[PDB]
Amino acid sequence: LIPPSMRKVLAIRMPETTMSYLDYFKSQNSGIEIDSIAELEDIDGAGTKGVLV
Amino acid sequence: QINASYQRDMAIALPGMVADTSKYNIDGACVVNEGDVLVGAAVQVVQAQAVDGHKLVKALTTGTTPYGVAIRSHWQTVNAQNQMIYEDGGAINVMTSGRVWMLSKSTEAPTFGSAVKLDVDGQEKSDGTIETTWTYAGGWTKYKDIQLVEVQLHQL
Amino acid sequence: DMAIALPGMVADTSKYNIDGACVVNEGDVLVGAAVQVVQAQAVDGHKLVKALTTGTTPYGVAIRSHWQTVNAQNQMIYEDGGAINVMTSGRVWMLSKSTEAPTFGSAVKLDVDGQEKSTWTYAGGWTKYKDIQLVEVQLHQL
Amino acid sequence: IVSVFNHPNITKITSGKWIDASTMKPETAEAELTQAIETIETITRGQHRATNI
Numbered sequence: 255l256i257p258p259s260m261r262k263v264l265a266i267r268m269p270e271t272t273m274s275y276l277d278y279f280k281s282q283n284s285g286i287e288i289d290s291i292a293e294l295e296d297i298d299g300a301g302t303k304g305v306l307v
Numbered sequence: 308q309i310n311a312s313y314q315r316d317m318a319i320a321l322p323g324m325v326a327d328t329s330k331y332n333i334d335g336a337c338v339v340n341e342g343d344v345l346v347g348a349a350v351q352v353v354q355a356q357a358v359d360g361h362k363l364v365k366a367l368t369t370g371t372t373p374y375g376v377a378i379r380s381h382w383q384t385v386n387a388q389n390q391m392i393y394e395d396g397g398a399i400n401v402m403t404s405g406r407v408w409m410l411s412k413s414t415e416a417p418t419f420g421s422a423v424k425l426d427v428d429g430q431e432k433s434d435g436t437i438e439t440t441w442t443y444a445g446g447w448t449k450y451k452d453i454q455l456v457e458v459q460l461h462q463l
Numbered sequence: 464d465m466a467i468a469l470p471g472m473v474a475d476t477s478k479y480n481i482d483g484a485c486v487v488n489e490g491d492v493l494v495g496a497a498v499q500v501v502q503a504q505a506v507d508g509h510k511l512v513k514a515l516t517t518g519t520t521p522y523g524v525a526i527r528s529h530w531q532t533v534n535a536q537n538q539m540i541y542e543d544g545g546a547i548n549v550m551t552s553g554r555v556w557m558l559s560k561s562t563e564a565p566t567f568g569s570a571v572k573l574d575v576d577g578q579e580k581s582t583w584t585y586a587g588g589w590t591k592y593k594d595i596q597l598v599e600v601q602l603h604q605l
Numbered sequence: 606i607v608s609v610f611n612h613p614n615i616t617k618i619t620s621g622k623w624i625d626a627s628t629m630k631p632e633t634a635e636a637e638l639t640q641a642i643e644t645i646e647t648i649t650r651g652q653h654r655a656t657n658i
Contacts, residue, residue: 258311262643276309290311313650332478355567355587358467362587372568404478462478462603463568463584 255306258290319448320408323347323379323391326446326457331405334375337362337398344393346384347410347455348429349373350401364399367429373439374463375403404462406444411456417443423458431456467590467597468556470495471527471539474588474599479553482523485510485546492541494532495558495597496577497521498549512547515577523549523602524557552604554586559598564589571600616644 256264264276276288297304323346325331340363344350351371354363367373377393378400384391393399412426413433421443424435446457471494473479488501488511498512500522515521526548527539534540541547559579565571567587574580579598588599618641623634638658645655 256309258313258647261309261311264309288309290309292311292313311646311651315650330478334477352567357564357587357589360588462601 255289255291255294257294257303257305258292259295260303260305261290318450320446320455321379321450322408322410322453322455323377324408325378325402326406326408326444329406332403332462333378334362334401334403335398336360337364337401339364339393339395339397339399341365342395343387344377344399345410345429346377346379346391346393347408349376349409349425350399350429364401367425367427367437369427369436371437372463373425373429373437375401376407376409376458376460378402378407402460404460406457406459408446408455409458411454413454413456416447417456419443419445431458466592468588468592468599469527470556470558470595470597471525472556473526473550474554474556474586477553480551480604481526482510482549482551483546484508485512485549487511487541487543487545487547488513490514490543492525492547493558493577494525494527494539494541495556497524497557497573498547498577510549512549515573515575517575521573521577521583523551524555524600526550526555550602552602554588554599554601556588556597557600559596561596561598571598616648618644 264279265274267274268278280286294304294306296302320326338361340353342365344364344366349367350364350373351367352362352364352374356362364374379391380400383393383398383400385394387394409431411431413431415433417433423439423441423443424432425437425439426432426435427437440461440463442459444457444459446455448455468474486509490513492498492512492514497515498521499515499519501511501513503510512522525541528548531546531548532539532541557579558577560574561579561581565585567585569585570582571585572580579600583603584601586599586601588597590597618637620637621630621633623630642655645653
């Protein structure tokens with residue numbers, strides 16, 4: 255689970271190729287699901303973000 | 308593509324709203340005189356009729372004793388100035404006992420059980436010149452650019 | 464038209480409390496007069512009420528009832544040795560000896576007979592009926 | 606009568622020129638379009654999704 259504002263980072267196309275980081279990560283890790291949750295936009299109440307595995 | 312879900316919370320209260328279902332008392336045999344009354348602000352009594360029974364109320368003024376606080380109603384209130392007001396010459400729901408959300412103009416949260424002080428216009432203020440029997444109940448929140456405070460009213 | 468009120472009758476339907484587990488210890492109690500608790504039994508739970516006397520703290524005001532008490536006079540009265548209704552919180556009409564209405568919210572004082580002479584507070588009702596001069600009183604429970 | 610371009614409560618984005626002195630910048634256009642779609646998705650909290658350009 256990742257913050258919804260971090261989906262743009264994983265969609266970057268990798269240098270000198272036509273495939274993105276998310277596709278490579280999914281190819282190397284088969285059977286793992288990725289979802290986005292707004293509750294992770296602020297965990298401590300002061301603006302800190304977080305990721306949950 | 309990664310699916311996303313969002314979340315949002317409602318507000319806690321509105322000005323003039325009854326706080327909770329504890330023992331309360333509403334005095335509905337009241338009439339507004341000489342002006343308009345804002346919901347969530349204290350009122351005073353200018354004359355109690357000896358035979359007819361109605362009480363004449365208006366907004367709070369310097370050197371006067373407050374009686375109660377007007378409450379919200381979707382049938383007895385007129386929508387003027389982009390908010391609810393009680394117009395002159397109409398019946399008003401005045402609460403004289405219980406917990407209520409009230410308009411405030413202070414900057415610091417109050418302490419539980421301390422005495423309530425009012426301003427000249429009828430809104431709560433930490434250093435007001437009007438003394439009241441009422442106490443603080445602990446609620447302290449903020450609607451969109453509006454401060455609110457939880458107040459416990461005892462029967463006069 | 465109609466008469467406006469009677470002694471001992473509840474004014475409004477606000478928060479009120481009535482103690483029905485009481486009895487008149489001595490004498491007769493007039494409906495609409497203040498009473499005091501002479502003796503409260505610890506185990507039996509009954510309160511012995513009496514007409515207010517000199518230098519005592521009032522408790523409540525006796526109310527009317529068409530079944531509990533009957534009497535041959537025009538005015539109701541509580542007989543000695545009978546169960547009595549006493550209201551300890553709310554708005555009630557009361558006997559008075561004053562002739563001018565006091566200020567609203569003022570603290571009222573009680574005479575030696577149980578009447579209203581020149582803590583409970585005035586409520587705003589001041590009427591006249593058969594030369595009785597009722598007054599409306601707000602009673603709190605302390 | 607107010608046109609669609611003069612409404613005072615719609616989102617407006619000032620853009621660097623896509624064509625300056627006959628020079629084309631096809632990456633600025635893509636960045637701005639993606640940003641606009643993201644804004645539409647975000648400010649309505651996933652209730653409305655951009656459909657037409």
